[PDB]
Amino acid sequence: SKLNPWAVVGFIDAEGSFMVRVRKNSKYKTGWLVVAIFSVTVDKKDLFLLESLKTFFGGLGSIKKSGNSTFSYRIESSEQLTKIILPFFDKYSLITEKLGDYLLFKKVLELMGTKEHLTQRGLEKIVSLKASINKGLSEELQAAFPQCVPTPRPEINNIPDPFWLAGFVSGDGSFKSILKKSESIKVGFQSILVFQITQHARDVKLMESLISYLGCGFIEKDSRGPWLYYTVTNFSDIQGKIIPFFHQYKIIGSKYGDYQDWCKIALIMQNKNHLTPEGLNEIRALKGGMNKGR
DNA sequence: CTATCCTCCATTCTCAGGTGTACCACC
DNA sequence: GTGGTACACCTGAGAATGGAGGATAGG
Ligand SMILES: [Ca+2]
């Protein structure tokens, strides 16, 4: 599978994690060991992607049981990381707030690169980085380093290439199918199609840009947190804007299968074969086997 | 000592799957 | 006053987030 670059970058922007890890091993010089990882974790169904991803990075890292149903691709070697992973994400930049995480990550590996992690001044610096990464410094660690100061998250700020969006959407996107109980329809149910991209409110500026990017969409915000939902319910737009896009820039992973069954429904709908009881049944079967289950 | 390998979590973050009802069609 | 559609709102399971120790292989 080709799996061009931009789809990868996007897919990571959505699902990827860069971790900098600091652990006390009194067997060291600064009573602390500093590890750096690049991890992707996915369901059993999407194992083929990880292997295609491993391949993509010239067979680097390892794939291994992570959760009860999940598996993890990881490059934990700093030589390897600095050799293959960085030169990539320098050339093909992330555009999400991840870019900030990676950027810090990059600095930690350069420090490691010069052996300045094995020193004291290097450690304090490296901790200042981690402090600005992910959820951030954590419990045990903070209490060990208080006189400290998290490093400023960088000035991040544009969708570089369509395929980014294909990949990105494969990670955090959603091709919903709804069966609504209507009281004013011959068959008792309204058939609906919804395309949905979920994300944290940090990336509000990017999310707003999609609307302009796809010429359609009505982003909104969760009621109970800083979660945004770029959404498309307008069937005519689904028909003429969403489908023809992802048809040309194909979804990578298990989701693609959904997108297909989704399209299948959208035909049953375009033909109006959704207001028949037969058409309804044809849709249910589709509904019931796609996304959840199958 | 230093770096990479390996086998395990727990809690939040996205997914996914509903509505309510305004406005549209119709004529 | 029928037969249909699209926002705007609502609410939860359970995997992704982002970790956690080890035990080693390279010194
Ligand atoms: Ca994600």
UniProtKB/TrEMBL annotation:
<feature type="binding site">
    <location>
        <position position="14"/>
    </location>
    <ligand>
        <name>Mg(2+) 1</name>
    </ligand>
</feature>
<feature type="binding site">
    <location>
        <position position="133"/>
    </location>
    <ligand>
        <name>Ca(2+) 4</name>
    </ligand>
</feature>
<feature type="binding site">
    <location>
        <position position="101"/>
    </location>
    <ligand>
        <name>Ca(2+) 4</name>
    </ligand>
</feature>
<dbReference type="GO" id="GO:0046872">
    <property type="term" value="F:metal ion binding"/>
</dbReference>
<feature type="binding site">
    <location>
        <position position="172"/>
    </location>
    <ligand>
        <name>Ca(2+) 2</name>
    </ligand>
</feature>
<feature type="binding site">
    <location>
        <position position="14"/>
    </location>
    <ligand>
        <name>Mg(2+) 2</name>
    </ligand>
</feature>
<feature type="binding site">
    <location>
        <position position="15"/>
    </location>
    <ligand>
        <name>Ca(2+) 2</name>
    </ligand>
</feature>
<feature type="binding site">
    <location>
        <position position="172"/>
    </location>
    <ligand>
        <name>Mg(2+) 1</name>
    </ligand>
</feature>
<keyword id="KW-0479">Metal-binding</keyword>
<feature type="binding site">
    <location>
        <position position="172"/>
    </location>
    <ligand>
        <name>Mg(2+) 2</name>
    </ligand>
</feature>
<feature type="binding site">
    <location>
        <position position="172"/>
    </location>
    <ligand>
        <name>Ca(2+) 1</name>
    </ligand>
</feature>
<protein>
    <recommendedName>
        <fullName>Homing endonuclease LAGLIDADG domain-containing protein</fullName>
    </recommendedName>
</protein>
<feature type="domain" description="Homing endonuclease LAGLIDADG">
    <location>
        <begin position="165"/>
        <end position="265"/>
    </location>
</feature>
<feature type="binding site">
    <location>
        <position position="15"/>
    </location>
    <ligand>
        <name>Mg(2+) 3</name>
    </ligand>
</feature>
<feature type="binding site">
    <location>
        <position position="15"/>
    </location>
    <ligand>
        <name>Mg(2+) 4</name>
    </ligand>
</feature>
<feature type="binding site">
    <location>
        <position position="15"/>
    </location>
    <ligand>
        <name>Ca(2+) 1</name>
    </ligand>
</feature>
<feature type="binding site">
    <location>
        <position position="171"/>
    </location>
    <ligand>
        <name>Ca(2+) 2</name>
    </ligand>
</feature>
<feature type="binding site">
    <location>
        <position position="14"/>
    </location>
    <ligand>
        <name>Ca(2+) 1</name>
    </ligand>
</feature>
<dbReference type="GO" id="GO:0005739">
    <property type="term" value="C:mitochondrion"/>
</dbReference>
<feature type="binding site">
    <location>
        <position position="15"/>
    </location>
    <ligand>
        <name>Mg(2+) 1</name>
    </ligand>
</feature>
<keyword id="KW-0106">Calcium</keyword>
<dbReference type="GO" id="GO:0004519">
    <property type="term" value="F:endonuclease activity"/>
</dbReference>
<feature type="binding site">
    <location>
        <position position="15"/>
    </location>
    <ligand>
        <name>Ca(2+) 3</name>
    </ligand>
</feature>
<feature type="domain" description="Homing endonuclease LAGLIDADG">
    <location>
        <begin position="9"/>
        <end position="108"/>
    </location>
</feature>
<feature type="binding site">
    <location>
        <position position="171"/>
    </location>
    <ligand>
        <name>Mg(2+) 3</name>
    </ligand>
</feature>
<feature type="binding site">
    <location>
        <position position="172"/>
    </location>
    <ligand>
        <name>Ca(2+) 3</name>
    </ligand>
</feature>
<feature type="binding site">
    <location>
        <position position="172"/>
    </location>
    <ligand>
        <name>Mg(2+) 4</name>
    </ligand>
</feature>
